[PDB]
Amino acid sequence: MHHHHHHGEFQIFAKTLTGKTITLEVESSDTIDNVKSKIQDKEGIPPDQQRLIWAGKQLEDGRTLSDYNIQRESTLHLVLRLRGGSMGGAADEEELIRKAIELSLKESRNSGGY
């Protein structure tokens, strides 16, 4: 029920596991489904095949942008899933989560160093 109007004055930045930078026009409260699909228009990749991991935690499809107060200048770490034959590389489908959290996200965990 996000109305039929349009006012994408606030954009965001998404970075795939491989490190691909993608910019999509979303809302401050945009939902994962909206974020994902929006990506499909950018990389074709279907939302059901796209996963979103942020802050060492996997974003649930029911999550919102305003949930964590995600501004516009945010790096949405996206991980491309793989249902077909395992690529047998760094990122596939499940290993893309633990690694997406240990590579560019671990920084947030490092803050726990006290």
Side-chain angles (χ1 to χ4, degrees):
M1 57 166 121
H2 63 279
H3 256 243
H4 302 341
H5 55 37
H6 301 293
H7 53 106
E9 223 295 288
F10 314 92
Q11 298 78 234
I12 56 157
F13 268 76
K15 191 117 79 220
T16 59
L17 188 286
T18 60
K20 211 275 170 72
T21 316
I22 313 164
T23 312
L24 37 153
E25 307 76 62
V26 311
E27 305 266 75
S28 57
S29 56
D30 207 58
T31 77
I32 303 309
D33 320 86
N34 284 73
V35 168
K36 298 211 284 187
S37 194
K38 273 171 201 281
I39 224 299
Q40 94 88 235
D41 172 81
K42 272 43 169 291
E43 290 191 310
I45 321 305
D48 46 79
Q49 204 183 82
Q50 290 267 226
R51 186 151 255 313
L52 242 304
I53 265 60
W54 196 79
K57 200 213 281 177
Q58 305 170 86
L59 300 168
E60 250 211 285
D61 301 282
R63 288 279 186 118
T64 51
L65 264 194
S66 54
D67 217 290
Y68 211 88
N69 213 93
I70 297 163
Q71 209 212 237
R72 46 179 291 100
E73 293 179 87
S74 51
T75 302
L76 260 82
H77 236 67
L78 171 148
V79 275
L80 288 150
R81 295 209 220 80
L82 179 51
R83 246 291 211 239
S86 248
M87 186 152 263
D92 285 73
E93 177 256 272
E94 44 277 290
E95 50 240 78
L96 43 65
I97 279 132
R98 56 185 284 176
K99 82 188 298 96
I101 294 163
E102 251 68 83
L103 59 99
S104 284
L105 254 308
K106 52 82 125 182
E107 184 270 303
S108 62
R109 192 255 298 154
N110 193 52
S111 80
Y114 215 88

